[PDB]
């Protein structure tokens, strides 16, 4: 039992590294392979050797290179200095790499600390935590206002506990200054404003709660037809050109989440460069003041040009920062930009280990890594004495090859997630954005949300139920139109084929770059829906009551009589709610309800 | 800084099969290291160490193992990874796939040596592309406009004129002080090499064009390093000499077909249709080497041409290209049989960076709205044309006859322009507004009433 502190490489083939002379090393330990100390992680060991996936580029690594063992798993540094910043997969600050090296590259050997040890943070204690008082794992013992928006509450780590022997007075402190000291059996454990936590270890918590409050994304088809809750899991499949990112950008700018963590896992570099351009010029108003939305956003950027095995480390980092701000009592929302490029990172690592594949080349443990990632979401009562509640919403966009939803990454995702916003390609061959296909998409947060809906917007539950019958019976009859023809339709069916065309063009379509449709509040969503459903109900009353007896209404005069009312209904998407009051707009609708009652 | 030790020269080959040579007793082999085989009959071949294990080194050769002995061949280990001599004088010369001159010239005098694999740009210091390149094609500059720093392929097929519109966007490449064009040809014919070479000398552009042409009879493992050479000189011109570079990687389906044979020789895990599992990351290492950075005044734009097999956009060549790049240009077969010269079907075409590159200060106010209505009037009239072939030419609504009036006036007047005509963006938007004049003012749903009052009565 001598435990040699070094190892030596024995063979490198792509991203994996076989390292000999590595006897007492544990699985998922962090090692540093190479003279430039590339960050690695042990995934397999056979006797004296150990196999290491490397989060850097192994081009140039010779055989006799040293591999030093760190004895600790892959972990993140959690504390102040983390909002507004951008990291890569292993959490090196890209703003502090570009200013330390003064170049435009990442030198693939840099050991920069994740949080800077020179910024002074204004610590204040909890004001009810005296010396000698007991303190358990996970309670807030300090408030550091990181920005004007986020009060970064300092918490004890969930492992240890004790009694307070020293708590720091209020003032300016570094991330290395000792703030709290404890005694448990007679041992002094000192604490700073940061804590280190492994990314593959789920954060401990008191008890899980069902989700009740919805996640208002701002999009009209997403909030009305297929709603998602905060604490819920959501998948957005779709091919290229469908708008998987635009739904993710519109949800990171205008949703009702407290913080936002955006993980670009193997996607375009200019997409992570447009995020940190238009976010600090976009503000939000919470307490009468305006502050930019970059103060509540943290980025984890691992593009497709970057190393391959760091796509896995960028997912587990982005969920561990998301569970950290969960424990302060915030409502985190996490957007994994591509969980299908993470699954292609697992396939390529498994191809170097010569593992037996599952269907389509992916490893057999693919559905277990996706399950242990989406299960870490949920609205859940946090650990600690101040008794707060947090939430994590995971909206991970799947990128299936060829637009085929019978894909072992998509079919493994849909067995886990509860919401599914399936984008369609043919709804992008005509400029129909957002391109959510309303026929295959679903949301299983309906029994959880009707109690919220029967308390705030009581008319909405039969509105979306009737709108889901109009949109489905149009598809049943548009199959008849392309085969038999429009001339053989009844009058109850020609009214359906044109109120649905009013739904897909006014309600469902939403141009995010226009100032009236960049964000649709939920009174405007129900407001323009209670008009277009009742107009369908009123035009049904002009058919069934006048069935056969008199000279009846054959829908051709409803077009002629209500030629401005059909312009009053198709232009409600214009009733700007940023600069138009809610009460104004609401009144404008009920007036259009009065005009249809007078015209019918 | 510099290597000074002498080079070890092994005659210790112990295995060769396919394109892979396996040496033994190699002393500290290095991953991705370049070796220099000399055959028993005296010819030289290069190689790259693909996997080390203890004292062995699995090198694949760039020219094939035809004739490699087990006793007489000698392999010399250059102690460094593949670097190429890059210079400003690589501008006006033609080269083959490996590194060498073709136009009876000397070797490069090596301003410095750059690694061909590159290193990825920090996404914090990468700025968004904003300045729209006016390329003089109405299907591009109207509805699929490119920016300065944008990666955008030309989705083509076999036999369609994608070489011709490649040489057309080379001449008319300007802003709305010339582009230093870098051209990489891989898996091309003899006539296709002479078509691009004699066109770059016709317009006098061969003073700033670096041709990297690799023919169809050249070895298929030299097609891997051909886009890596043509993008490591393009990074030298754009990120060090502050030059605006236009990179054209023609026949990108010949690169990835040459990527399938190497991975099938290594017995790698296959993805779809035999292509390797790392095809997304290997394509993105040459597609994401584009854009402009904050400290420099240069930029690099990529227009990689590829021919999709069987006119299929769900093949792994054009499907994985759409996920990396920023929108595509789709030429069509149905618009080529009608002898329209640019057969650009605009419906599966896209420009993801056109929204930031057009507007009031960029081109003019009406650009973002007429392009959404020219796209929707084209998509409806193709649905009407798919309806009149089943129903009839006379059982249509009278509104559906304007959509047949649009498409016959769209394809011949908007996109068809001829091989030497370079319409400006103000020429295009005054041609594109004429086709919307045949519709009523309240049938144009995508254009609001404000900018309809300033442009539609004319």
């Amino acid at each position: 039992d001598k435990e040699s502190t070094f190892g030596y490489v024995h063979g490198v083939s792509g991203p994996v590294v076989t390292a000999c002379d590595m006897a007492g090393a544990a699985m998922y330990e962090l090692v540093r392979v190479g003279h430039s100390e590339l960050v690695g992680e042990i995934i397999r060991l056979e006797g004296d050797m150990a196999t290491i996936q490397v989060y850097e580029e192994t081009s140039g690594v010779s055989v006799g290179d040293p591999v030093l063992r760190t004895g600790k798993p892959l972990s993140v540094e959690l504390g102040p200095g983390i909002m507004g910043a951008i990291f890569d997969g292993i959490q090196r600050p890209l703003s502090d790499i570009s200013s330390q090296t003064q170049s435009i590259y990442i030198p693939r050997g840099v050991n920069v600390s994740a949080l800077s040890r020179d910024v002074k943070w204004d610590f204040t204690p909890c004001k009810n935590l005296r010396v000698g008082s007991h303190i358990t794992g996970g309670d807030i013992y300090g408030i550091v206002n990181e920005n004007s928006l986020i009060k970064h509450k300092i918490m004890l780590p969930p492992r240890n506990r004790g009694t307070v022997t020293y708590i720091a007075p209020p003032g300016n402190y570094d991330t290395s200054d000792v703030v709290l000291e404890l005694e448990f059996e007679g041992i002094k454990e000192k604490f700073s404003m940061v804590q280190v936590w492994p990314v593959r270890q789920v954060r401990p918590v008191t008890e899980k709660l069902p989700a009740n409050h919805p996640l208002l994304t701002g999009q009209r088809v997403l909030d009305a037809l297929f709603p998602c809750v905060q604490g819920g899991t959501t998948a957005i499949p779709g091919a290229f050109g469908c708008g998987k990112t635009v739904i993710s950008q519109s949800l990171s700018k205008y949703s009702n989440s407290d913080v936002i963590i955006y993980v670009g896992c193997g996607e375009r570099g200019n997409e992570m460069s447009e995020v940190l351009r238009d976010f600090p010029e976009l503000t939000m108003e919470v307490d009468g003041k305006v502050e930019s939305i970059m103060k509540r956003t943290a980025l984890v950027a691992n593009t497709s040009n970057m190393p391959v095995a760091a796509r896995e480390a960028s997912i587990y980092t982005g969920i561990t920062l998301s569970e950290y701000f969960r424990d302060m009592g915030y409502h985190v929302s996490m957007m994994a930009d591509s969980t299908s490029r993470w699954a292609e990172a697992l396939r390529e690592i498994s191809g170097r280990l010569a593992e037996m594949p599952a269907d389509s080349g992916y490893p057999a443990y693919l559905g277990a890594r996706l399950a242990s990632f989406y299960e870490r979401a949920g609205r859940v009562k946090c650990l600690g004495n101040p008794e707060r509640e947090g939430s994590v919403s995971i909206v991970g966009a799947v990128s299936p090859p060829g637009g085929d939803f019978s894909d072992p990454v998509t079919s493994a995702t849909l067995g886990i997630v509860q919401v599914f916003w399936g984008l369609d390609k043919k709804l992008a061959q005509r400029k129909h954005f957002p391109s959510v296909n309303w026929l295959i998409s679903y949301s299983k947060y309906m029994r959880a949300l009707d109690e919220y809906y029967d308390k705030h917007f009581t008319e909405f539950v039969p509105l979306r139920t009737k709108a889901k019958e109009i949109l489905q019976e149009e598809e049943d009859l548009a199959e008849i139109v392309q085969l038999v023809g429009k001339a053989s339709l009844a009058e109850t069916d020609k009214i359906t084929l044109e109120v649905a065309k009013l739904i897909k063009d006014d309600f469902l379509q939403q141009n995010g770059y226009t100032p009236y449709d960049r964000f649709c509040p939920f009174y405007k969503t129900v407001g323009m829906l209670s008009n277009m459903i009742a107009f369908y109900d009123m035009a049904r009353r002009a058919v069934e009551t006048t069935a056969q007896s008199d000279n009846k209404i054959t829908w051709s005069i409803i077009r002629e009589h209500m030629g401005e009312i059909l312009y009053k209904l198709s232009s409600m998407k214009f009733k700007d709610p940023v600069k138009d009051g809610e009460a104004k707009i609401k009144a404008d609708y009920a007036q259009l309800l009065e005009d249809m009652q007078n015209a019918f | 800084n510099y290597l000074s030790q002498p080079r070890l020269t092994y005659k210790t080959v112990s295995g060769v099969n396919g394109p892979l040579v396996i040496l033994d007793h190699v002393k500290f082999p290095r991953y991705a290291e370049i070796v220099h085989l000399t055959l028993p009959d005296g010819t030289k071949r290069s190689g790259q160490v693909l996997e080390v294990s203890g004292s062995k080194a699995v090198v694949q050769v760039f020219e094939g193992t035809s004739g490699i002995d087990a006793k007489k061949t000698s392999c010399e280990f250059t102690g460094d990874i593949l670097r190429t001599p890059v210079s400003e004088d690589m501008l006006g010369r033609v080269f083959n796939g490996s590194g060498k001159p073709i136009d009876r010239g000397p070797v490069v005098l090596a301003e410095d040596f750059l690694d061909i694999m590159g290193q990825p740009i920090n996404p914090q210091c990468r700025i968004y592309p904003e300045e729209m390149i006016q390329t003089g094609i109405s299907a591009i500059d109207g509805m699929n406009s490119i920016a300065r720093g944008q990666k955008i392929p030309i989705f083509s097929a076999a036999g369609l004129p994608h070489n011709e519109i490649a040489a057309q966007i080379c001449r008319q490449a300007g802003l709305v002080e010339n582009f230093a064009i870098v051209f990489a040809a891989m898996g091309v014919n003899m006539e296709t090499a002479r078509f691009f070479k004699s066109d770059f000398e016709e317009n006098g552009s061969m003073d700033n064009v670096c041709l990297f042409l690799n023919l169809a009879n050249d070895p298929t493992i030299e097609r891997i390093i051909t886009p890596r050479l043509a993008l490591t000189t393009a990074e030298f011109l754009a990120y060090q000499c502050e030059k605006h570079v236009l990179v054209i990687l023609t026949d990108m389906s010949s690169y990835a077909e040459a990527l399938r044979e190497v991975s099938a020789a290594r017995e790698e895990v296959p993805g779809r249709r035999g292509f390797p599992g790392y095809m997304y990351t290997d394509l993105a290492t040459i597609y994401e080497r584009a854009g402009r950075v904050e400290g420099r005044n240069g930029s690099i734009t990529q227009i990689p041409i590829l021919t999709m097999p069987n006119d299929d956009i769900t093949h792994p060549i054009p499907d994985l290209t759409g996920y990396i790049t920023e929108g595509q240009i789709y030429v069509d077969r149905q618009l080529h049989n009608r002898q329209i010269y640019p057969p650009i079907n605009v419906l599966p075409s896209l420009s993801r960076l056109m929204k930031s590159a057009i507007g009031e200060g960029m081109t003019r106010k009406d650009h973002a709205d007429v392009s959404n209505q020219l796209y929707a009037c084209y998509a409806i009239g193709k649905d009407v044309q798919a309806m009149k072939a089943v129903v009839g030419e006379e059982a249509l609504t009278s509104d559906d006859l304007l959509y047949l009036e649009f498409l016959q006036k769209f394809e011949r007047n908007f996109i068809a322009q001829g091989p030497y005509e370079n319409r400006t963006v103000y020429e295009t938007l005054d041609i594109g507004w004429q086709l919307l004049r045949i519709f009523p003012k309240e049938m144009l749903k995508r254009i609001p009433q404000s900018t309809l009052s300033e442009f539609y009565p004319r």
């Binding site: 037996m356 594949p357 | 895990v269």
Partner: peptide
Amino acid sequence: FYRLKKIQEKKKILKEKSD
């Protein structure tokens, strides 16, 4: 085809040890 050629490469290695 890839799963069967993976096994015939593994069965050859185990038959190279027992020599």
